[PDB]
Amino acid sequence: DVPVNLYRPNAPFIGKVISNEPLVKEGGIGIVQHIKFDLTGGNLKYIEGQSIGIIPPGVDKNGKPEKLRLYSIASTRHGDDVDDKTISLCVRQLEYKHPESGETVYGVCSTYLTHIEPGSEVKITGPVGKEMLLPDDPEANVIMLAGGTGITPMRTYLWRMFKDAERAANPEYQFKGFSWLVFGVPTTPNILYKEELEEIQQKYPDNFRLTYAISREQKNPQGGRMYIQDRVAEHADQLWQLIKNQKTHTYICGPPPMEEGIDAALSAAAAKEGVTWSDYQKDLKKAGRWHVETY
Template structure:
């Protein structure tokens, strides 16, 4: 696994022993495959007491006690993102999460009693439900050079791995409007089907707002003709010329980010190694890739 972390001082303000009391403002489903998973957009009101850098994550403390340990449930980590325009809330006092939750059939409730506790809690919560959070954590963040528009960006994601990039794009768009000239941004996003293409409308809006600077490539693993299906690592190889152009043109360096399930990490790194096999600074490029993966 390759990591490069920006040398910025981050302060964890809230811990398991001293969490921040917040309130869930809204929960809405934003995707699902109708078989084993659904995806939800959660808006949490922190009353302006919680700040984070785009790319960081928080811990959510689900209520209750584990039947196995007789102790409070452990916190679950979720990437933080700004709220969307159509959430209808004050962005200075709220943030959002994009989560995956299991589809639990009536006959499987016992099996899920002690697993996926936090995602089940969040996905079924109503407006006004209290929730405790910890953090912020993590250094999967944009560098000062990225924020100043000095680099091109290659963002690679699967599933809810797209969530931290929503914060990146929001931040970069705001500085873009202030006059900073950004390089190219390429998001390569792997999903099962159009029904699990998370934040599609928001991403398409970003594409239009960046005026040609942002491009999104979507790889469907279970949709379309068999010859057209593939995973995100396959899309990197299929569109290698485009990927190479982002990471080797216009005199800019390129920052590469990978976020998603741990099972895709090795294959994505292998594809990147093949795509950039002729790059004069291959070792340096690969060693500077920033990775955030989860089980």
């Protein structure tokens, strides 16, 4: 059923870049690009929540070919144009400090991708992953906790749930549950897919709630910069109440350090009802209702 590894590193699918557009608006921090690839000529198929590998050209400092880097798929199974002909990615250009051999360091694969030109051929592998799949039940509740590019799998879920063209193409999935996205980024211009996310909330006020944690524009009750963990603590009781439903699924995607604060928040909420979150969570994971993908 679930498509997986239709293409592997030894014989990748050679796709062509259709478009490469900026997602970080003026005044934002960093570079994050939405890149769409043409899948025609191959049989790569995928579903929401999966990832694909990209093999960048060139060799590493040791002279060996570069290995693949995984990227969460940003598009639904049908592609952004709902034509079953493309696949998209949401790629941040990795760049960091000086104390790392030299002065400025740019990630190999992410810099290759963010600067790639339309028409270029790219080596693609996958799809991969069964840990971040969306339930087929249209009545399920879906909690999405995302940091930065962690928004990516969430975009695939939300588009499938709320885009007009998606609903028309998926007669078997007419979402009527409740979805809540808590999205943490440093600035408003850094709110990836902002316009479309807010459009969805305006059209489906009873099925989608959007909450932002904007660090450079908001402060938590302690006076520190606002991060996703702070919003989760602020809404811990509401989130725990939703999590208690047998049909609720939670997805966490973003930096590894985000998990600790989220668990501490939910632990305090669950404790009010005599429940130890760490134990309840273990059962949720075993039931496949607690999905995590951090990097």
